[PDB]
């Protein structure tokens, strides 16, 4: 049983969980009740999976807008660093993934429609512009599952 | 048995471990073999402590030089985020601490000499300018231990 997790580490990102012979699942990244990721709630979400130790997690490499201030670059690195630290500390095998990696394999901005096509049972969850993070997480997971025959 | 850990999260930072009725200890933050923190080695160091769950960890709030580029602010946030994520994921109780907090309680740049005075048995480890991170980690731990009678 080889699970694959895909993570969009942005503050409006998400986590996708793909288990073999099971429908896909996706989870909005929890935020504090202050736009800020909630490390405690991320840890608890991950722990609730009871995933096999060493389960592979693919994390999109955060790259910031060219037009972002100094606290904006600090914030993107903080969130990416928090996810890496959480995942490595939780026993997962962590593979950073440039956004170009999955965007290239899936014709890619159409990520929401592309995710709906690959994961029809989740299309209701990708209808709105806010669902971009859910879409990226699913595509990253799909990418990390690889091309494989039965 | 109430342990206190102090962490300077900078790339040349360090971790200080204070146990009751034991001499203090300090550890350079491990780096990759590429200036880059090594998340796997940080996790393993923390796990090797076998600390009580919920042990309190005080982490200096990373603030970057005003004169630092966009990748420089991204790097300081990444390292601070990685430490927070590692510590929360590892079950510790994490308290961020402004540098002003301990600098104010210990007359504070003289942190290396101040650390040597408070922790004489470690003064050999604070002799060089490279030992700044060790000094800050110890001061943060001393600060987090609090003022308390026997």
Residue numbers in the entry:
A (entry chain A), B (entry chain A): 109 to 142, 150 to 223, 231 to 272
Q: What's the paper's own text on this?
A:
Recently, mutational screening analysis identified the chloroplast-localized HJ resolvase MOC1 that is essential for chloroplast nucleoid segregation in Chlamydomonas reinhardtii and Arabidopsis thaliana. MOC1 exhibits dimerization and an RNaseH fold, belonging to the retroviral integrase superfamily. Moreover, we characterize a base recognition loop (BR loop) that protrudes into the junction and disrupts the C–G base pairs at the crossover. Residue D183 from the BR loop recognizes the cytosine, determining the cytosine-dependent HJ resolution.
We first determined the crystal structure of HJ-free ZmMOC1 (T107-V280) via iodide-based single-wavelength anomalous diffraction (I-SAD) at a refined resolution of 2.5 Å and the structure of a quadruple mutant NtMOC1 (N108-S275, I112V/Q162K/E235Q/239Q) at a 2.0 Å resolution. For each protomer, the core of NtMOC1 is formed by five-stranded β-sheets (β1β2β3β6β7) composed of three antiparallel (β1β2β3) and two parallel strands (β6β7)—a characteristic feature of the RNase H fold, belonging to the retroviral integrase superfamily. The β-sheets are flanked by six α helices (α1 and α2 on one side, and α3, α4, α5 and α6 on the other side). The α-helix 2 (α2) from each protomer constitutes a helical bundle, where G192, G196, G200, and A204 form a hydrophobic patch on the dimer interface. Both analytical ultracentrifugation (AUC) and size-exclusion chromatography (SEC) experiments revealed that double mutations of G200E and A204E could disrupt dimer formation. A structural homolog search by Dali40 revealed that NtMOC1 has the highest structural similarity with RuvC resolvase. NtMOC1 in the complex also exhibits dimerization, and the HJ is embedded into the cleft of the dimeric NtMOC1. Structural alignment of the apo NtMOC1 with HJ-bound NtMOC1 revealed minor conformational changes with an RMSD value of 0.527 Å over 242 Cα, which mainly arose from the loop preceding α2 (we termed this loop the base recognition loop (BR loop), discussed below). Mutation of Y180 (Y180A) has little effect on HJ binding and resolution activity. Although the overall structures of apo and HJ-bound NtMOC1 exhibited similar architectures, residues Y180 and D183 in the BR loop underwent striking conformational changes, demonstrating the great flexibility of the BR loop.
